[PDB]
Write an enzyme that holds these catalytic residues in place. Structure first.
Site, PDB file in Angstrom:
ATOM      1  N   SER A   1       0.692  -1.293  -0.037  1.00 14.77           N
ATOM      2  CA  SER A   1       0.059  -0.021  -0.052  1.00 14.77           C
ATOM      3  C   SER A   1       0.750   1.334  -0.212  1.00 14.77           C
ATOM      4  O   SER A   1       0.159   2.190   0.506  1.00 14.77           O
ATOM      5  CB  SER A   1      -1.121  -0.013   1.028  1.00 14.77           C
ATOM      6  OG  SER A   1      -2.362  -0.689   0.584  1.00 14.77           O
TER       7      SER A   1
ATOM      8  N   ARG B   1       7.107   6.172  -5.232  1.00 12.74           N
ATOM      9  CA  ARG B   1       7.837   7.039  -4.270  1.00 12.74           C
ATOM     10  C   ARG B   1       7.367   6.317  -2.752  1.00 12.74           C
ATOM     11  O   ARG B   1       6.615   5.907  -2.448  1.00 12.74           O
ATOM     12  CB  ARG B   1       7.445   8.325  -3.984  1.00 12.74           C
ATOM     13  CG  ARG B   1       6.089   8.746  -3.471  1.00 12.74           C
ATOM     14  CD  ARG B   1       5.845  10.269  -3.349  1.00 12.74           C
ATOM     15  NE  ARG B   1       5.113  10.581  -2.116  1.00 12.74           N
ATOM     16  CZ  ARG B   1       3.949  10.768  -1.810  1.00 12.74           C
ATOM     17  NH1 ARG B   1       3.031  10.662  -2.876  1.00 12.74           N
ATOM     18  NH2 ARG B   1       3.621  11.266  -0.528  1.00 12.74           N
TER      19      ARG B   1
ATOM     20  N   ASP C   1      -4.600  -2.378  -0.670  1.00 15.57           N
ATOM     21  CA  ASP C   1      -5.855  -2.944   0.156  1.00 15.57           C
ATOM     22  C   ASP C   1      -7.165  -2.735  -0.141  1.00 15.57           C
ATOM     23  O   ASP C   1      -7.945  -3.385   0.299  1.00 15.57           O
ATOM     24  CB  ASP C   1      -5.145  -2.652   1.616  1.00 15.57           C
ATOM     25  CG  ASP C   1      -5.760  -1.084   1.817  1.00 15.57           C
ATOM     26  OD1 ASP C   1      -5.321  -0.135   1.442  1.00 15.57           O
ATOM     27  OD2 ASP C   1      -6.598  -1.329   2.908  1.00 15.57           O
TER      28      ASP C   1
END
EC number: 2.7.1.1
Length: 469
Positions: free
Chosen positions: A141, A156, A194
């Site tokens: 995530s 990132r 998720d």
């Protein structure tokens, strides 16, 4: 109790923080355009990311699947046994992530730690060893890009991570290489967000599932669209994907209304945005997530203090500091059970050294109710916009997150806001046609269920991403 001066301030706050039905319907209406713009070739502030899940679970999938969830503190490893009857069994182990691991300077290191923890898990769980490979899905995530279910390009690092040579690379082969080095017969076959597992695992046990939704620190929703209605994939889907096939979408709709055209942003919301890490971004998340409610409360109280209504002759040195109040402040104030608001009185005295009067506590309490109600009302506009876009007149909305599960009264107020939006007349939350219900686990069960759908396609040679990869 309340004097006339305080009563006029409470009535001013009712006008600032109340979001009537007509505002909800206008927000929702603009939200449906933005959803459609995000699916178009030109794109928009809502990313509307294809999740590469192109099947609905039937509820009859069965067998052993693994899922890993790479969190902030812990690596969680889950063995999910799909019952084949809309039920499943899970077995999990948590492997705390060393302090030094988040910032390592050896890029292989994190993957070695995950593979070593997998090895220990497998040792405990399959004592006689395992003969045929087990499909694994990875809940990653962090901000990533995907063009097929079994890749994941890190855009990132986040949450303190800072590891060199991973950004802009595919993380699936990095993890797969360490698994194969140790001879574990596990295949990584899916990398998900998720929220998209929340949808898919709740659909497995509840086929009325129209969406998976998180109401936590961050906000997000995922649902199934239809590939012929997604303009930006036109000509990118191989011929083995029928035009009417479903496509799971990870909206990432925390950026809704970064253009500032409909959300009811107040003077306090403008100040939160200006003091945040990224001014101008995450506008819908800042207007609807539970993470900011203590800071909204704090600013409204600082205004009252400054204008000479409250906290007269008190020292505010400890209170006058941004984000000194997190979500649990308003939550505790709303739960204070008795009329004189004794818990609130203890809280302000013990934490900040502030002595309040009863009347001050009624203004604080009334402010905390207004702010928790506004966040609940605005947070369902994304649900309504998806159900109206897709034409779902009935269904279950699978929800998760710490605000949904724990913030006092959030569930009733979110359900009643849907009612207002739609103009329903039923009077018990249980007869509403579109209901919010507890989700199954998206990080664990959801990645495993998605791994089961991807592996079947991969086995059959069917597409799992755009033409090209």
């Amino acid at each position: 109790d309340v004097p006339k001066e305080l009563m006029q301030q409470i009535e001013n706050f009712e006008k600032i923080f109340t979001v009537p039905t007509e505002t909800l319907q206008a927000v929702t209406k603009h939200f449906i355009s933005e959803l459609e713009k995000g699916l178009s070739k030109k794109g928009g502030n809502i990313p509307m990311i294809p999740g590469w899940v192109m099947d609905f679970p039937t509820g009859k999938e069965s067998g052993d699947f693994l899922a890993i969830d790479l969190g902030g503190t812990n690596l969680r490893v889950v063995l999910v046994k799909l019952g084949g009857d809309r039920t499943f069994d899970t077995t999990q182990s948590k492997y705390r992530l060393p302090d030094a691991m988040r910032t390592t300077q050896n890029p292989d290191e994190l993957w070695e730690f995950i593979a070593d923890s997998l090895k220990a898990f497998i040792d405990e769980q399959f004592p006689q060893g395992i003969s045929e490979p087990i499909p694994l899905g990875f809940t990653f995530s962090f901000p990533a890009s995907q063009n097929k279910i079994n890749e994941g390009i890190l855009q990132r690092w986040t949450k303190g991570f800072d590891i060199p040579n991973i950004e802009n690379h595919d993380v699936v082969p990095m993890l797969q290489k360490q698994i194969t080095k140790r001879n574990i017969p596990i295949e990584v076959v899916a990398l998900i967000n998720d929220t998209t597992g929340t949808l898919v695992a709740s659909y497995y046990t509840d086929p009325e599932t129209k969406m998976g939704v998180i109401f936590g620190t961050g906000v997000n929703g995922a649902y199934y669209d239809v590939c012929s209605d997604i303009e930006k994939l036109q000509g990118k889907l191989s011929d083995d994907i029928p035009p009417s096939a479903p496509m799971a979408i990870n909206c990432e709709y925390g950026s809704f209304d970064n253009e500032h055209v409909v959300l009811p942003r107040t003077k306090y919301d403008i100040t939160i945005d200006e003091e945040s890490p990224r001014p101008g971004q995450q506008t819908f998340e800042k207007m609807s997530s539970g993470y900011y409610l203590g800071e909204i409360l704090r600013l409204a109280l600082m205004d009252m203090y400054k204008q000479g209504f409250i906290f007269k002759n008190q020292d505010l040195s400890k209170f006058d500091k941004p984000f000194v109040m997190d979500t649990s402040y308003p939550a505790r104030i709303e739960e204070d059970p008795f009329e004189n608001l004794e818990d609130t009185d203890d809280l302000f005295q013990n934490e900040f050294g502030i002595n309040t009067t009863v009347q001050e506590r009624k203004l604080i309490r009334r402010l905390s109710e207004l702010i928790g109600a506004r966040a609940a009302r605005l947070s369902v506009c994304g649900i309504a916009a998806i159900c109206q876009k897709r034409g779902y007149k009935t269904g279950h909305i699978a929800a998760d997150g710490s605000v949904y599960n724990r913030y006092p009264g959030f569930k009733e107020k979110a359900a009643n806001a849907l009612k207002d939006i739609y103009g329903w007349t039923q009077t018990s939350l249980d007869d509403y046609p579109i209901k919010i219900v507890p989700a199954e686990d998206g990080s664990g069960a959801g990645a495993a269920v998605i791994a089961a759908l991807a592996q079947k396609r991969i086995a059959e040679g069917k597409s799992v991403g755009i033409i090209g990869a």
